[PDB]
Design a protein around this ligand. Structure first.
Ligand SMILES: CC(=O)NCCc1ccc(S(N)(=O)=O)cc1
Ligand SMILES: CC(=O)NCCc1ccc(S(N)(=O)=O)cc1
Ligand SMILES: [Cl-]
Ligand SMILES: [Zn+2]
Length: 259
């Protein structure tokens, strides 16, 4: 059974024993060296089209919480930039720290942010998410950094429901949530080929990491940190530090959409 996690006994340094691609050639996350990233005029405009996004449910899966979408039609899609074709939004989730000084997966000139949002999309040419993750261009994940400062009003409905999904396996109805409230003003980004950042660590992702962070309040991220990795009735293990550290860049280039 799956027994990977974020603890000393089952965390990222152990994953390779059950998921040997952990030591692969295109693993994520990575440190983004902003001086070495090169502007690419070939990149087409990024198109985030969430007007018809249809959220359904929020789930504590024991690793993070996912806000799930109806992906049975092209209701919410990502296109353009480095992408060929249409990628459909399936879910978003976050990674975050025990303290404001850590929590992000990607880093920017080695800087760690308090958290990182991942909007996960699958390439419609593969029909379903399960098939998409077996393809090198199966997924596009839009990553957005969170820093602690002013509150993000568009996040508060998420924070408000966390009380109801404290433990692993709990879910709650979560309809009519607009993910556009989680974006920064600018769509300026970095992009590179990588992987899922949790087991199974599949090398199927085109990463698109926005340069501009969003600000959330200390009180908002403190509520993330009250979640539990454990199930109901088990010893409490706060859901904190659910991030994988930066992995070797190997033979990759990070491209910038700007400057
Ligand atoms: C729950 C616990 O700590 N189990 C220890 C054994 C255990 C550690 C790591 C993994 S892996 N390679 O999938 O990350 C599986 C099992
Ligand atoms: C069945 C299956 O492979 N599910 C993978 C779920 C999964 C989706 C996205 C990510 S991340 N943090 O890279 O955005 C990790 C895991
Ligand atoms: Cl794959
Ligand atoms: Zn993630």
């Amino acid at each position: 059974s799956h027994h990977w996690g974020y603890g000393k006994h089952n965390g990222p340094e152990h994953w390779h024993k059950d998921f040997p691609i952990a030591k692969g050639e295109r693993q994520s996350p990575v440190d983004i060296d902003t001086h070495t990233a090169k502007y690419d005029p070939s990149l087409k405009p990024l198109s985030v089209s969430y007007d018809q996004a249809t959220s359904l449910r929020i789930l504590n899966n024991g690793h993070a919480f996912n806000v799930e979408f109806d992906d049975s039609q092209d209701k919410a899609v990502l296109k353009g930039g480095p992408l060929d074709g249409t990628y459909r939004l399936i879910q978003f989730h976050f990674h975050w720290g025990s303290l404001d000084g850590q929590g992000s997966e990607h880093t920017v000139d080695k800087k760690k942010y308090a958290a990182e949002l991942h909007l996960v999309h699958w390439n419609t040419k593969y029909g379903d998410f399960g098939k998409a993750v077996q393809q090198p261009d199966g997924l596009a994940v839009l990553g957005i950094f969170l820093k602690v400062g002013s509150a993000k009003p568009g996040l508060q409905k998420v924070v408000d429901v966390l009380d109801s999904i404290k433990t692993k396996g709990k879910s709650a109805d979560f309809t009519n949530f607009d993910p556009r409230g989680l974006l920064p003003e600018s769509l300026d980004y970095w992009t590179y080929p990588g992987s899922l950042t949790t087991p199974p660590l599949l090398e199927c992702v085109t990463w698109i990491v926005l340069k501009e962070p969003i600000s959330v309040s200390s009180e908002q991220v403190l509520k993330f940190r009250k979640l539990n990795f454990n199930g109901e009735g088990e010893p409490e293990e706060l859901m904190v530090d659910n991030w994988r550290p930066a992995q070797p860049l190997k033979n990759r280039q990070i491209k910038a959409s700007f400057k």
